[PDB]
């Protein structure tokens, strides 16, 4: 199917410390493969997936130089934005930046993006054409003017359509057994008396990859979602994910409810009923 | 690969 490479950068100002905290992470699909943390002793971009450890010293010197340069830019952006909003130098503030590219099933370029937030809300963003910007407010409008005068869209377009996409393809091939490979969910149902007149059916999907998954409850074949809970998808810590969906039911009507599971690792969708 | 050599200030 389609695949992504995304990098996430967070910078937090710290009044009374010398530098802001900067943290950078990169993913391919739902798999993390690198990190940088300004507070760690290494001061290098560091591998987090076995298949990037094979890249040589030129790769790691470059990635580290670039990611250190992003932290220096956010260090200045923190002071500029404090100024624009006339904020006290006493408070902690956040910048976040996310960019990357998607690629289709043919591995050709689908889309590219670049978003920037201040204190958890949209500040500036590249539109889908990769030639223009959306700005949230008058401070962002000033940056927009700056970035238009400096031709930042052109630089980024070239990276997103060239470099981003190419190295994504390259990471897909190296680590094929990790990234391309699919773990179907291991499933089961539990049952709980919640009262004297009611009972919970909980449908589990365990140990799957990737994380996209759809869990639904039908009653007598009729998709329905009243007194349903589906928990947020969660990492197991091994590179796999977990999720459940629950329904509260009249005591006795157990057999009438069915749990449907869709995951690209399943040949055909799975159906489950409470067994006894 | 990250974008480089570097981004521009806001």
């Amino acid at each position, epitope marked *: 199917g389609s695949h992504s490479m995304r990098y996430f950068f967070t910078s937090v100002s710290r009044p009374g410390r010398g530098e802001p905290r900067f943290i950078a992470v990169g993913y391919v699909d739902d798999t993390q493969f690198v990190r940088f943390d300004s507070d760690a002793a290494s001061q290098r971009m560091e591998p987090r997936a076995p298949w990037i450890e094979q890249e040589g010293p030129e790769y790691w010197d470059g990635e580290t130089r670039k990611v250190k340069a992003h932290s*220096q830019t956010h260090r200045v952006d923190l002071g500029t934005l404090r100024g624009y909003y006339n904020q006290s130098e006493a408070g902690s503030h956040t910048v976040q930046r996310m960019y990357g590219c998607d690629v289709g099933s043919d591995w050709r370029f689908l889309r590219g993006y670049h978003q920037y937030a201040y204190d958890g809300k949209d500040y500036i963003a590249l539109k889908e054409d990769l030639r223009s910007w959306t700005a949230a407010d008058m401070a962002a409008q000033t940056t927009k003017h700056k970035w238009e005068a*400096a*031709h930042v869209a052109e630089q980024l377009r*070239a990276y997103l359509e060239g470099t981003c996409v190419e190295w994504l393809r390259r990471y897909l091939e190296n680590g094929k057994e990790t990234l391309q490979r699919t773990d179907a969910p291991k499933t089961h149902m539990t049952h709980h008396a919640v009262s004297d007149h009611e009972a919970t059916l909980r449908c589990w999907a365990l140990s799957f990859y990737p994380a996209e998954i759809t869990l639904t409850w039908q009653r007598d074949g009729e998709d329905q979602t009243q007194d349903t809970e589906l928990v947020e998808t969660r990492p197991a810590g091994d590179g796999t994910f977990q999720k459940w969906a629950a329904v509260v039911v009249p005591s006795g009507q157990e057999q009438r409810y069915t749990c449907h599971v869709q995951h690209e690792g399943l040949p055909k969708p799975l159906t489950l009923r409470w067994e006894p | 690969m990250v974008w480089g050599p570097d981004p521009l200030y806001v």
Partner: T-cell receptor
Framework: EVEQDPGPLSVPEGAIVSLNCTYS??????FMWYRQYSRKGPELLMY????GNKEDGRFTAQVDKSSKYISLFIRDSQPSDSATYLC???????????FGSGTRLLVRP | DAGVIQSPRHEVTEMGQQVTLRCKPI?????LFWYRQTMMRGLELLIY????????DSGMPEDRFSAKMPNASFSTLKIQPSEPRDSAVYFC??????????????FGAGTRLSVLE
């Protein structure tokens, strides 16, 4: 690494001059030409990103990324074009420029 | 309208002594580059700085050479001890991101250094 023939090139006023450079590293994406007068700093003339051709008055710069070959043409050369011409390039991970060793050009009045 | 200012413009010195080269970038510029040119004929980057932090120093000789930028208007390149093979013209340049994106940088007039046997 960058290869540039040192010359010296001696041409008559009005002549078209051709300077060029080869490289090996396919990560280079920006290509520049500089001129330098005797005992002075280098002055940028033309710059190119990725591939193609660029005209500015008497100068045309060209880049063929597949042959890894780049060129500068000077139409209607003049006595004041006499200088050393250097090519330089970089990729996208650093502002570090790599230079060729330069070509000395005399244009005879 | 001042450009980059380099000092001294000329330096003649006996090997074994300390040599100091200085550069004042154009004010407002946050990138500063030190290059070297010997009549082994072309330029080579020694180091560049951004916001006074050194960014790439792969061209720095492994010994005797040290560059600093103690504030945004002043950088120093020092050689202790100097040797004849260090004779060169040393150029300083400064720029900004948006000029560097079209590969423009602004060059000092250079320091011409002769270290003598």
């Amino acid at each position: 690494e960058v290869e540039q023939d040192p010359g010296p090139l001696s041409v008559p006023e009005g002549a078209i001059v051709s300077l060029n450079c080869t490289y090996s590293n396919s990560a280079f994406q920006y290509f520049m030409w500089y001129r330098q007068y005797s005992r002075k700093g280098p002055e940028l003339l033309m710059y190119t990103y990725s591939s193609g051709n660029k005209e500015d008055g008497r100068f045309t710069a060209q880049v063929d990324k597949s042959s890894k070959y780049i060129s500068l043409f000077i139409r209607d050369s003049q006595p004041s074009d006499s200088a050393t011409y250097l090519c330089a390039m970089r990729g996208d991970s650093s502002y570090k420029l790599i230079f060729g060793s330069g070509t000395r050009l005399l244009v005879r009045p | 309208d001042a450009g980059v200012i380099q000092s001294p413009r000329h330096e003649v010195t006996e090997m074994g002594q300390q040599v100091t080269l200085r550069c004042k970038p154009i004010s407002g510029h946050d990138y500063l580059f030190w290059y070297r040119q010997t009549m082994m004929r072309g330029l080579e980057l020694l180091i560049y700085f951004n916001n006074n932090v050194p960014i790439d120093d792969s061209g720095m000789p492994e010994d005797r050479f040290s560059a600093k930028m103690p504030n945004a208007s002043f950088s120093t390149l020092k050689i202790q001890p100097s040797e004849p093979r260090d004779s060169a013209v040393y150029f300083c340049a400064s720029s900004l991101w948006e000029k560097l994106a079209k590969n423009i940088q602004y060059f000092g007039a250079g320091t011409r250094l002769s270290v003598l046997e």
